[PDB]
Design a protein around this nucleic acid. Structure first.
Ligand code: MG
Ligand code: MG
Ligand code: MG
Ligand code: ZN
Ligand code: ZN
Ligand code: ZN
Lengths: 50, 145, 55, 56, 290, 55, 97
RNA sequence: GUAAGAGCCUAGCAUGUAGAACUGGUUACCU
RNA sequence: GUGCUCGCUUCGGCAGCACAUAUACUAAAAUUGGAACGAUACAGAGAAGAUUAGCAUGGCCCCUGCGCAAGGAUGACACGCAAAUUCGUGAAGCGUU
């Protein structure tokens, strides 16, 4: 791969701004990721019906 | 109690306090070469205990040689190294005025008789990683299924 | 910062007129208007100038 | 497409004199040479501010 | 942007064993090994047989991560950054990909140059909470083998024609079949797969440490090395910190003191505070379970 | 040496500055190589001044 | 005016980079307190004095590093509260007109 | 029918770096 | 190293004193990575039919130029299921209170 930018997208968060924090503790809670299911999944299935 | 050694010290930029001094050049370089030559010098800290005058270094050799500097005539004078001399500048390809090598120590220093072979082994260890030679594997492999 | 020399004069005039109209329609609309519709008014300005040249 | 208006201009502050003098460039034009290196001031008959202060 | 700040941010094992230093200042000499923007390079000689060390990173890239500009170790402890972030949290997440790195560097430079110029801008609040295992393997006295001239590569081919005059060492380089040999700059700086820090963490994990209360609700503490020179009146004065103290059985014949607390949480907290740390009356007090 | 270090830093290996400061292409150039290797009045003024001094 | 003239001089120094090319030897001293004390560090001392000489610049040397590298605009300073009035109520009639 | 993407192929211009973390442990009472 | 030493004192050595006071991006290297615009295959000029002068706009695209000139195909890119907060009528059939 020969390019300056472009590999910066999957490697990390592109021009990352952390959310400004305050008055409520937001360190314990976290989100549950997406179920892969790589035996039914289609490129059409992620983007949805146009 | 909510501060560390760095956070409790009176610091100016992340590692301590830095302020412009105005020490005399000669005395500064005197104590600098005093430490660089023998291993001791006087203390340039400005309080540290606020009593008289302490030496900071290999303080055991300080009292042995009376606390002398480089600008002063030394106590010890012995074991001079012997060098060639041809100060005449009249014989061509024999002159060495201040370019006079010592009589004892000599030029190119090979390591030893075993150290060379060990360095050859460590270069061979470097060679196996570069890798570039690969024979076409004709090794036969058979049996009876 | 490129200078407006001789080949940029008309393009820069039309670049600045359009910005002036943008400012004036942002300040002319009252308080609760949807703040779209700048492009359409600029198209009408272009059409009024072409009808001016066309008499 | 290719032919398009602007709808947003360029913002100043990111080049040649804008933040660190483009990190101190050694590039300079002919128009950036020393020229008119002395401010003229208004003289006593011209309209100096002392002369303009007492006037009705 | 350029960096341009006077008088670098240095530790004591690189600044030398002489209190009198002559350093040179070059205004925009090198580019940073991390930031890749040019900074003010300071060049000094620590001692007599040293190497003329110089600063490798910006003032800014040392303010981000509270390190020395040439050994890239913590100013307070003298340890790699992976060890210190192991004994802390890791919430910096400095970007490594290109445009993100220069963008993050620009924004943090504006952040630092919109502030005082004294504190490790993000590491400060987490730098309050400290004294984990890193203090029990912090180096006590400076390792002056760092400031030391590299192996003479002409002496490796047995062809050093300078001989006795060469200022480079005539001694063995390390075998490259070693994990302790690769060591990139950015690997040492971001805290990622640093083998020195790996070995320090492997040592600090096998450091002697607390065991849990194997049987339920037992708060009994088995104190060996109690000593016959101390008093039990001082024991309660050290021990009412934790909570509702229950009975304290004292046996001064085996030098063992037995302790009971209200909840097992208080006994675990006491195990945390006490084990292999607590020295009272200048005499080590050993506490165990069972 | 200065003029052909300027040539070799620009990777223009297809140009040749002779010993009398005549700049000639070694081969027949593409359009891209010809646009890359166009110099200005600074290079050619310095080259012709050096031609006069070498004469 | 004294603060502005210094920045003016630093800008204008580019306009003539080499006319009477520069001079540099105010070799200065600085006293520094390591904030690391616990002494095995200076040798037993609390401070250290450092003589700073500025490195002498080569007249004949071009600029060293690429400066043309270009990056997008960072975040602006944190938003100010907007302080408007309650807001006049809007009618369907005027919204359509 | 262009000397440019792309896209491949082979190439060569800068560095002279920072760093090497390695040692401690006892047992005991009444029914 | 040189000189003075009403220094021992010979013309050999030593003693004292004076003057002289800290070079070096420390390499003849070991390494370490990134680039070129050339071939070699596929490829072919923007403006709603065709042939086309151009001048702009914007920036994580630059090149030639001393250029705040001017060129680079109008230098290239730009072609998009272009959906941003926020709803309701009337009649009919079925089940429900
Ligand atoms: Mg043009
Ligand atoms: Mg055309
Ligand atoms: Mg264009
Ligand atoms: Zn940096
Ligand atoms: Zn250091
Ligand atoms: Zn050597």
């Amino acid at each position: 791969r020969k390019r300056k930018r472009g590999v910066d997208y999957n490697a990390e968060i592109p021009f990352e701004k952390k959310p400004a924090l305050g008055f409520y503790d937001t360190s314990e809670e976290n989100y549950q990721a997406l179920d892969a299911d790589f035996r039914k999944l289609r490129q059409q299935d992620l983007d949805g019906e146009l | 109690p909510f501060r560390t050694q760095q956070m409790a010290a009176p610091r100016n930029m992340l590692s301590g306090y830095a302020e412009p001094a105005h020490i005399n050049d000669f005395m500064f370089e005197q104590q600098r070469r005093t430490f660089a030559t023998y291993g001791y010098a006087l203390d340039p800290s400005l309080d540290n205990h606020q009593v008289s005058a302490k030496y900071i270094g290999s303080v055991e050799e300080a009292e042995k040689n009376q606390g002398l500097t480089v600008f002063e005539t030394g106590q010890k004078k012995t074991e001079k190294r012997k060098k060639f001399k041809e100060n005449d500048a009249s014989n061509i390809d024999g002159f060495l005025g201040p370019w006079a090598k010592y009589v004892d120590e000599k030029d190119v220093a090979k390591p030893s008789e075993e150290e060379q072979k060990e360095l050859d082994e460590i270069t061979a260890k470097r060679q196996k990683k570069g890798k570039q030679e690969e024979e076409k594997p004709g090794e036969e492999k058979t049996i009876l299924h | 910062a490129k200078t407006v020399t001789k080949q940029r004069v008309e393009s820069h005039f039309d670049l600045e007129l359009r910005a002036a109209v943008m400012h004036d329609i942002l300040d002319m609309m009252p308080e609760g208007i949807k703040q779209n519709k700048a492009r359409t008014i600029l198209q009408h300005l272009s059409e009024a100038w072409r009808c001016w040249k066309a008499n | 497409t290719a032919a398009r208006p602007t709808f947003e201009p360029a913002r100043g502050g990111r080049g040649k004199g804008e933040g660190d003098l483009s990190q101190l460039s050694k590039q300079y034009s002919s128009r950036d040479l020393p020229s008119h290196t002395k401010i003229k001031y208004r003289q006593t008959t011209q309209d100096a501010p002392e002369e303009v202060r007492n006037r009705d | 942007n350029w960096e341009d700040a006077d008088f670098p941010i240095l530790c004591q094992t690189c600044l030398g064993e002489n209190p009198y230093i002559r350093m040179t200042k070059e205004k925009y000499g090198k580019e940073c090994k991390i930031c890749a923007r040019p900074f003010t390079v300071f060049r000094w000689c620590p001692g007599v047989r040293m190497r003329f060390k110089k600063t490798e990173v910006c003032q800014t890239c040392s303010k981000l991560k509270n390190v020395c500009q040439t050994c890239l170790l913590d100013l307070e402890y003298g340890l790699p950054i992976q060890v210190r972030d192991a004994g802390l949290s890791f919430k910096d997440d400095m970007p490594k990909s290109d445009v993100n790195k220069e963008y993050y560097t620009q924004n943090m430079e504006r952040e630092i140059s919109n502030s005082d110029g004294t504190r490790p801008v993000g590491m400060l609040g987490k730098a309050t909470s400290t004294s984990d295992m890193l203090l029990k393997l912090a180096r006590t006295t400076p390792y002056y083998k760092r400031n030391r001239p590299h192996i003479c590569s002409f002496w490796v081919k047995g062809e050093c024609k300078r001989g006795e005059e060469c200022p480079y060492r005539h001694e063995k380089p390390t075998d490259p079949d070693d994990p302790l040999a690769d060591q990139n700059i950015k690997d040492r700086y971001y805290g990622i797969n640093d083998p020195v820090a790996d070995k320090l963490l492997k040592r600090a994990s096998t450091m002697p440490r607390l065991d849990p209360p194997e049987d339920k609700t037992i708060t009994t503490l088995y104190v060996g090395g109690l000593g016959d020179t101390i008093t039990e009146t001082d024991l309660r004065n050290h021990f009412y910190q934790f909570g509702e103290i229950r009975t304290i059985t004292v046996v001064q014949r085996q030098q063992c003191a037995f302790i009971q607390f209200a909840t097992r949480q208080a006994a675990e907290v006491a195990a945390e505070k006490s084990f292999n740390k607590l020295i009272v009356n200048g005499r080590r007090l050993n506490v165990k379970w069972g | 040496n200065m003029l052909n270090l300027l040539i070799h830093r620009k990777n223009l290996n297809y140009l040749h500055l002779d010993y009398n400061f005549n700049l000639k292409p070694v081969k027949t150039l593409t359009t891209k190589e010809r646009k890359k290797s166009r110099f200005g009045n600074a290079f050619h003024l310095c080259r012709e001044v050096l031609r006069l001094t070498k004469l | 005016r004294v603060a502005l003239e210094k920045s003016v001089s630093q800008k204008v120094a580019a306009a003539m980079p080499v006319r009477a090319a520069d001079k540099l030897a105010p070799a200065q001293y600085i006293r520094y307190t390591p904030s690391q004390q616990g002494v095995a560090f200076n040798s037993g001392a609390k401070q250290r004095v450092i003589r700073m000489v500025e490195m002498q610049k080569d007249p004949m040397e071009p600029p060293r590093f690429k400066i043309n590298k270009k990056i997008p605009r960072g975040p602006p300073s944190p938003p100010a509260p907007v302080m408007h009035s309650p807001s006049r109520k809007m009618t369907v009639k005027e919204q359509q007109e």
